[PDB]
Design a protein around this ligand. Structure first.
Ligand SMILES: CCCCCCCCCCCCCCCCCC(=O)OC[C@H](COP(=O)(O)OCCN)OC(=O)CCCCCCCCCCCCCCCCC
Ligand SMILES: CCCCCCCCCCCCCCCCCC(=O)OC[C@H](COP(=O)(O)OCCN)OC(=O)CCCCCCCCCCCCCCCCC
Ligand SMILES: CCCCCCCCCCCCCCCCCC(=O)OC[C@H](COP(=O)(O)OCCN)OC(=O)CCCCCCCCCCCCCCCCC
Ligand SMILES: CCCCCCCCCCCCCCCCCC(=O)OC[C@H](COP(=O)(O)OCCN)OC(=O)CCCCCCCCCCCCCCCCC
Ligand SMILES: *P(=O)(O)OCC(C)(C)[C@H](O)C(=O)NCCC(=O)NCCSC(=O)CCCCCCCCCCCCC
Ligand code: SF4
Ligand code: SF4
Lengths: 238, 60, 242, 185, 122, 186, 80
């Protein structure tokens, strides 16, 4: 029953819902951070500090393994090779495709490790969904139209969009097993930085920080010396 | 001297929530009470209108 | 009146006598030396991590101040917001102080709060009448009105600020009242004029002039130079004899 | 959001409960909705207050309580002999947070240090008691009086004549208030 | 724009060519708005009289040769423009801008030495 | 139960037939009516408190006539000066260590000049240039100062005896229980 | 068109900052020929914008520096 936390379930902090796949999100973020820090010199303490905190937290995230992970990985690895065209971002786009009624999935490479990002149709009431969630792009252009407005109306989509039932050449992506609720609590007890959801938030911010630090080159000599008397207050001479 | 607490210390004062339930607002007796008035009223209304109907017969 | 049976008169209970009260002499600065080393180490690590912009840091009691050049305002506050060892995710306050003896007369003071680490930090930069400062509105939404207040009271521009306008002074108010050279009662005053049937601004005229008793300041210094409390881990070693 | 260290025990809320899992019977649920039970209970509270004694006092026939420390209309006081208590130290003029006091002084005809002007602008005064605290001779005090609203603003510019007359009229209160609170001053 | 009606994000000018465009852009918005300003505050002057005041305000700062100072003046102009076109100013504020409507006149300084001396420093 | 007895709440009580009526009709008979008792409340008036009883207290160290020199308790003039570290000072602290922990021996002569060398070097090259010449090993040394990992900000409460975060935890007694969306933290 | 020019004279001749009237041509320039400094030019284009009741973009206004440039610009704009 309470073995696995429910994605979207309120955590207690308003607007912070329970994470769908929290362990892999941390691995994705940490590995994305280490790779992004490779463009900083080795004498930057900033780089040395982020590395120490991330590789230490990374080691702890790897220390907790979802039940049956090894069984899942073999098939999932086996599935990527035989259907690589289905998950390569260069073909289906970084979002996995324009079909939202269907499931999307993209292989991605970070820090020497590979991740699959998956997107699913939102669970919505059948009484309210129209055409199983297919995007409404208005009606087609009927009447006497020029060629130009036909192309502006996405007529080429006729030759490339796929019916949602049409799954002949493609395969169903199977999700990674999840950490149990007991496993989540003991892992975040190891990190000691709040709830798993907050720890992911801190990882997302830390990933965002590297780009600012590189663009600012914060490891180089002081940009502007303080001119004499700049920081002199009313202190009495000792 | 100065304003000081009593040697024993002041006794504890009520601060925790105290909004005790009462039977005057439980819905089950209220629903039973309302049903009895309606049932009694319709019993009196059947007897009333039937009598009123017989008075119209005599008047006509 | 009808009294409560178990509520006796609380004044009627005699109190135990009090005699020779003894209170020890406490220096309140001593309790912060336990963390004096840690605050210097944190300031030093920040300086090492951002040497291009952090000019100096200072530790007074439990308050750590970081002194930076205006160009590094965005990089430094990004680091204080997003670093895993610096999660100062709230701006408590932004304000300014005026120092006419300085070429950069305006000192800009930011106070930050890290709820996760239960810590506070102070960041100081400087500005001029014509030298702007980067707005931190892109990192902190709460910073929006604080920068408008600094601009209203001191005339400091924040580049990147959306909607930098007055927040406190009247519309069409001339001057920046928190400048040391701005006089206390200002320059003008208003009244209702019965000919114009409206309110009119006029040159300021006080029925009783302000009396400044600043000249009564003590002819002798009353505080002294104070005490040095730099920890040993941040004082230089000394050569041994012979 | 949470403090550093491991998450507080049981900080994470349990998952939301579905309608099916609510531990409350339908009849009770329907009854409260249609009968408005909690609104009836709130109305019953008002009837309880309807039969409790009101807190109203009939002012100005009755008055609310004030303390010996109460800060009202200013007065200048005398010694029992009738000599002015004021010796023009200017301590009250210097401490005044609102600059409401203006004083001038010279030697009196007998050579005594006395004031020639003692004005208080009652439309500048913030009624803080700082003058009364600073006075070394108990010359300036705030009376308990608060009922002196005036027709014109000029009537609130007190000179020395107005203040010494106030002290003459209010002296028994002024001494009683000083008598009660002087141990704490 | 985004925050409120006439809100302009604070930016530095890149060069003197950039600054001049903004100054002309600022003047153009001001004298264009002069008809609306008249009817919006019921100013008892013609748009011609209002538009002259706009030019003089821009002419007090015609001789500025410092880029940072221009950025300050441009920011002030945008702030005044926004608080005028939004009805944030009141008729008292805009009317006070016209120096003729002070009961001591507009020539509030002595014409020469001897008029100020005979009246007593103006 | 939650309620304290009406018999202990310093308010006018009902009597006789009216108290029985009150206990039979009100929602909670232990609830007071907020009317204070005239023999107990502000009785006597503070203006009739005997002035001679109250004693202005004096603590004997601060208020002794014998063994309290002012300079020993003059804690205002013993105020801490702010401890200021510039980029030059940190380079010196990295080059030759500190007084609590030096980097080299620095014994008398040839060490006094060696120490001042670490000062003028700190002035000339800042922290960044110093680290860049020395390389990644110096960067690891800066983190070695804080024990390998970067330091954490000091906490602001000393209840446990050390400066730290306050360990917010749910109170064993939830005032609303679970019937309302508000939780008691101790 | 020619109807625009006859309206153009109605405002430039009425302008008090012209060095000398009748100096207007079909291709006269505000600066070189008519002796108008920067802001006097800003005002002239604003007066033309009022006559044709069409707002002129600041970039388009910078392009307009001559009597012909305005005559050409107004014709392109649909409103008049
Ligand atoms: C009249 C004022 C009554 C005041 C006394 C009272 O509260 O009686 C409530 C009565 C008994 O409930 P009680 O046992 O006192 O509460 C639990 C305490 N441990 O609780 C009751 O049973 C009385 C409430 C039910 C009355 C039913 C008859 C009237 C129904 C009217 C329906 C109106 C619908 C709208
Ligand atoms: C808005 C409110 C709308 C909702 C109303 C909810 C309550 C409705 C209840 C209806 C009950 C009707 C009353 C029943 C009744 O009164 O029957 C009376 C009748 C005998 O009465 P009668 O002979 O005329 O004279 C009295 C003799 N001593 O008895 C009979 O002869 C016929 C009884 C038939 C009973 C059918 C089931 C009744 C329930
Ligand atoms: C509008 C005026 C008010 C109308 C409503 C007032 C009367 C409410 C009658 C009680 C409603 C529910 C009756 C019932 O049988 O409930 C049982 C069932 C679920 O059982 P449950 O109580 O949840 O089990 C215990 C779990 N703790 O719940 C159910 O399955 C729902 C069954 C509903 C049957 C309702 C029949 C009574 C209709 C009364 C109409 C009144 C007309 C006169 C006005
Ligand atoms: C004189 C004798 C005594 C008179 C007693 C008067 C009592 C006070 C009357 C004050 C006015 C009534 C207040 C009603 C308050 C109200 O409108 O609440 C709105 C509420 C919203 O409920 P809803 O939108 O249906 O969705 C619920 C899911 N959250 O909707 C509701 O709560 C509706 C529930 C009340 C229905 C009452 C009508 C039915 C009466 C019995 C049948
Ligand atoms: P032309 O060659 O004649 O002049 C072009 C300029 C002005 C660019 C100069 O040649 C020049 O080089 N100037 C130097 C830089 C400069 O232009 N300074 C910037 C000044 S901006 C300025 O003055 C803004 C003032 C706006 C005031 C508007 C009116 C006041 C508000 C109230 C309106 C009326 C009441 C509602
Ligand atoms: S009222 Fe008291 S404090 Fe003020 S001048 Fe007179 S003696 Fe001094
Ligand atoms: S009460 Fe306070 S404000 Fe009023 S005169 Fe005395 S010191 Fe000044």
């Amino acid at each position: 029953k309470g073995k696995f936390l429910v994605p979207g379930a309120p955590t207690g902090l308003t607007g912070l819902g329970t994470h769908p796949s929290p362990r892999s999100a941390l691995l994705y973020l940490y590995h994305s951070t280490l790779e992004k820090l490779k463009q900083i010199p080795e004498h930057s303490v900033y780089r040395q500090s982020v590395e120490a905190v991330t590789r230490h937290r990374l080691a702890l995230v790897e220390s907790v393994v979802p039940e049956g992970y090894d069984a899942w990985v073999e098939r999932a690895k086996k599935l990527l090779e035989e259907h690589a065209d289905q998950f390569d971002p260069t073909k289906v786009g970084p979002e996995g495709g324009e079909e939202v009624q269907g499931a999307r999935a993209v292989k991605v490479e970070r820090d020497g490790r590979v991740f699959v990002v998956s997107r699913l149709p939102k669970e919505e009431d059948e009484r309210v969904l129209e055409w199983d969630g297919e995007v409404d792009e208005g009606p087609e252009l009927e009447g006497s139209r020029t060629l130009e407005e036909k192309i502006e109306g996405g007529l080429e989509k006729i030759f490339t969009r796929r019916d949602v039932k049409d799954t002949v050449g493609r395969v169903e992506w199977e999700p990674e097993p999840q950490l149990t609720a007991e496993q989540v609590a003991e892992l975040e007890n190891k990190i000691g930085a709040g709830l798993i959801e907050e720890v992911i938030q801190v990882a997302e911010g830390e990933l965002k920080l590297v780009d600012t630090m590189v663009k600012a080159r914060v490891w180089e000599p002081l940009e502007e010396q303080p001119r004499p008397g700049q920081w002199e207050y009313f202190e009495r001479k000792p | 001297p100065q304003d000081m607490p009593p040697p024993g210390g002041y006794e504890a004062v009520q601060y925790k929530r105290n909004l005790p339930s009462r039977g005057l607002f439980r819905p089950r007796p209220l629903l039973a009470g309302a049903a009895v008035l309606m049932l009694y009223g319709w019993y009196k209304l059947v007897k009333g209108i039937r009598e009123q109907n017989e008075l119209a017969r005599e008047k006509m | 009146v009808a009294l409560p049976k178990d509520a006796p008169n609380p004044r009627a209970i005699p109190r135990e006598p009090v005699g020779e009260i003894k209170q020890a002499l406490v220096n309140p600065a001593d309790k912060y030396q336990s963390k004096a080393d840690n605050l210097h180490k944190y300031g030093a690590w920040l300086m090492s991590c951002l040497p291009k912009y952090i000019q100096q840091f200072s530790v007074w009691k439990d308050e750590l101040t970081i002194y930076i050049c205006p160009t590094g305002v965005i990089p430094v506050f990004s680091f204080l917001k997003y670093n895993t060892n610096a999660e100062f995710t709230q701006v408590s306050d932004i304000t300014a102080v005026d120092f006419p003896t300085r070429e950069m007369r305006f000192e800009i003071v930011y106070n930050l709060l890290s709820v996760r680490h239960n810590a506070r930090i102070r960041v100081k930069t400087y500005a001029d009448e014509v030298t702007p400062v980067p707005s931190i509105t892109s990192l902190y939404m709460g910073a929006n009105w604080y920068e408008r207040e600094v601009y209203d009271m001191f005339g400091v521009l924040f580049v990147g600020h959306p909607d930098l306008r007055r927040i406190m002074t009247d519309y069409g108010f001339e001057g920046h009242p928190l400048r040391k050279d701005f006089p206390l009662t200002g320059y003008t005053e208003i009244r209702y004029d019965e000919e114009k049937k409206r309110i009119v601004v006029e040159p300021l005229e006080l029925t009783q002039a302000f009396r400044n008793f600043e000249g009564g300041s003590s002819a002798w210094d009353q505080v002294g130079p104070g005490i040095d409390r730099t920890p040993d881990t941040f004082k230089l070693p000394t050569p041994k004899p012979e | 959001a949470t403090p550093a260290g491991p998450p507080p025990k049981n900080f994470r809320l349990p998952p939301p409960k579905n309608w099916d899992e609510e531990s409350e019977s339908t009849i009770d649920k329907v009854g409260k909705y249609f009968l408005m039970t909690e609104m009836l209970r709130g109305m019953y509270v008002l009837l309880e207050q309807f039969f409790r004694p009101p807190y109203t006092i009939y002012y100005p026939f009755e008055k609310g309580p004030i303390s010996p420390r109460f800060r009202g209309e200013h007065a200048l006081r005398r010694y029992p002999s009738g000599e002015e208590r004021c010796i023009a130290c200017k301590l009250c003029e210097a401490v005044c947070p609102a600059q409401a006091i203006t004083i001038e002084a010279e030697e009196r005809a007998d050579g005594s240090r006395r004031t020639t002007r003692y004005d208080i602008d009652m439309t500048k005064c913030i009624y803080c008691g700082f003058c009364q605290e600073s006075c070394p001779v108990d010359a300036i005090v705030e009376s308990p009086n608060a009922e002196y609203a005036t027709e014109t603003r000029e009537e609130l510019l007190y000179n020395k004549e107005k203040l010494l007359a106030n002290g003459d009229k209010w002296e028994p209160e002024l001494a009683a208030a000083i008598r009660a609170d002087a141990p704490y001053r | 724009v985004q925050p409120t009606k006439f809100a302009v994000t604070v930016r530095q000018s890149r060069n003197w060519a950039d600054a001049k465009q903004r100054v002309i852009a600022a003047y153009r918005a001001w004298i264009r708005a002069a008809p609306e300003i008249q009817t919006m505050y019921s100013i008892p002057f013609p748009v011609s009289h209002i538009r002259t005041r706009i030019r003089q305000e821009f002419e007090r700062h015609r001789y500025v040769n410092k880029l940072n100072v221009v950025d300050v003046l441009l920011q002030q102009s945008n702030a005044d423009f926004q608080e005028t076109m939004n009805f944030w100013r009141q008729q008292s504020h805009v009317m006070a801008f016209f120096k003729e409507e002070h009961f001591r006149g507009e020539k509030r300084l002595p014409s020469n030495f001897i008029t100020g001396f005979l009246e007593g420093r103006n | 139960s939650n309620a304290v007895s009406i018999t202990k709440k310093y308010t006018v009580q009902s009597t006789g037939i009216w108290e029985r009526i009150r206990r039979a009709l009100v929602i909670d008979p232990n609830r007071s009516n907020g009317v204070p008792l005239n023999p107990y409340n502000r009785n006597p008036s503070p203006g009739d408190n005997p002035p001679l009883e109250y004693t202005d207290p004096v603590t004997i160290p601060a208020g002794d006539i014998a063994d309290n020199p002012y300079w020993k308790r003059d804690f205002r003039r013993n105020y801490p000066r702010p401890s200021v570290i510039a980029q030059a000072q940190q380079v010196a602290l990295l080059s030759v260590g500190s007084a609590a922990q030096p980097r080299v021996e620095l014994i008398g002569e040839e060490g006094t000049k060696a120490l001042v060398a670490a000062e003028e070097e700190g002035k000339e090259k800042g922290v960044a240039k110093y680290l860049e010449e020395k390389g990644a090993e110096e960067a690891k040394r800066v983190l070695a100062l804080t024990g390998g990992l970067p330091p954490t900000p000091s906490g602001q409460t000393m209840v446990t005896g050390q400066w730290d975060v306050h360990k917010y935890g749910l109170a064993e007694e939830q005032s609303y229980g679970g019937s309302y969306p508000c939780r008691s933290f101790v | 068109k020619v109807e625009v020019y006859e309206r153009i004279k109605s405002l430039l001749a009425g302008f008090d900052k012209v060095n000398d009237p009748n100096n207007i041509t079909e291709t006269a320039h505000f600066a070189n020929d008519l002796g108008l400094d920067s802001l006097d030019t800003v005002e002239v284009v604003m007066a033309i914008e009022e006559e044709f009741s069409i707002e002129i973009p600041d970039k388009d206004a910078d392009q307009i520096h001559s009597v012909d440039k305005a005559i050409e610009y107004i014709l392109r704009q649909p409103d008049a």
